[PDB]
Ligand binder design. Structure first.
Ligand SMILES: [Zn+2]
Ligand SMILES: [Zn+2]
Lengths: 129, 125
DNA sequence: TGCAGTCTAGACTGCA
DNA sequence: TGCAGTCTAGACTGCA
C-alpha cells in the first residue's frame, strides 16, 4: 500500500501496475512526471493511487493535469496524448490515439478541451476504430 | 538563399579544430548561421574571420542573449562565445580561460542584449 | 545560492 | 494542410 509519501515509493507502487506497453524507463518517466505534478494536488494523487491499486473497484474522482496548447504530452522526448499515454500504461498496452471515449461523468475529459485534462484511465473506455 | 547558408556551414566545418563531434559541430554552426541570415554584414564578417584564422579584424558577430547566457546545442548546455571559440581555436578550452578584446563592442562580459561570438574578439588565458 | 545537467512545452521542420 | 517528429530557452533539480 502507499499514500502520499516519497515520490520514489509511489512511483514504484504504480510501476508494479504497468502492463508493459512500453519500456521500463518510459513508464518510470511518464509516472514520475505525473506524480510530481500531482504532489500539488494530493487529493488527486490519492485518487490516482486508489484507482490504480483497486483496478477501478470503486468510482474515482478525476485526476487532472494542465492542458497543453496542442493537447500533447511529451515524455522522455516522445510525443503523445496524455489520457492515452496513461491508459496505455495501466489498462491497455496496445492502445491507439483515437481509440478511447470518456465516461459520461468525467468533467475534464480530453475531448472536452477544458483548461485541465483528466488522465484517470478508469474515466475512459476503449472504443476501437 | 538556402543553398547559400549550407555552402557557408560546410565551409566553416573545414576550419573546425575537431574539438567536438562532427554532428555537434554542424548543429552548432547551422544554429549560428541561421541566426545571422539577416545581418548579412556580420555574417560575412564571421566568414572572413574564421577562414583566415584571424588575418583581418572584423565586425562583432552577435546573437540574442538568453536569460542565463547559456546556449544549448544538440542537448549540451554551454556558453556561446566559448562554444564557438572551442570549435575553431581551442578544442580543450575551459569556461574561465577566456578574456575579451578591448575593441569588441558586444563582448560577453558586457551583459548587453546581444553577445558577440566572433572568436577573434576573445583571447585565451 | 550558484553551478552544471535534465526535461518538456512551444516553436519549428519535413515528409505525405 | 496535417501529422509526427526534432530542437532548445526556460523551468527545474541535485550537489556543494
Ligand atoms: Zn476524469
Ligand atoms: Zn566582438
Amino acid at each position: 500500500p502507499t499514500s502520499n509519501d516519497a515520490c520514489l515509493s509511489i512511483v514504484h507502487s504504480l510501476m508494479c501496475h504497468r502492463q508493459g506497453g512500453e519500456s521500463e524507463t518510459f513508464a518510470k518517466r511518464a509516472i514520475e512526471s505525473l506524480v510530481k505534478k500531482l504532489k500539488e494536488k494530493k487529493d488527486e494523487l490519492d485518487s490516482l493511487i486508489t484507482a490504480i491499486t483497486t483496478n477501478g473497484a470503486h468510482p474515482s474522482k478525476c485526476v487532472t493535469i494542465q492542458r497543453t496548447l496542442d493537447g500533447r504530452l511529451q515524455v522522455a522526448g516522445r510525443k503523445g496524448f496524455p489520457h492515452v499515454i496513461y491508459a496505455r500504461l495501466w489498462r491497455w498496452p496496445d492502445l491507439h490515439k483515437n481509440e478511447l471515449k470518456h465516461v459520461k461523468y468525467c468533467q475534464y475529459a480530453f475531448d472536452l478541451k477544458c483548461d485541465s485534462v483528466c488522465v484517470n484511465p478508469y474515466h475512459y473506455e476503449r472504443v476501437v476504430s
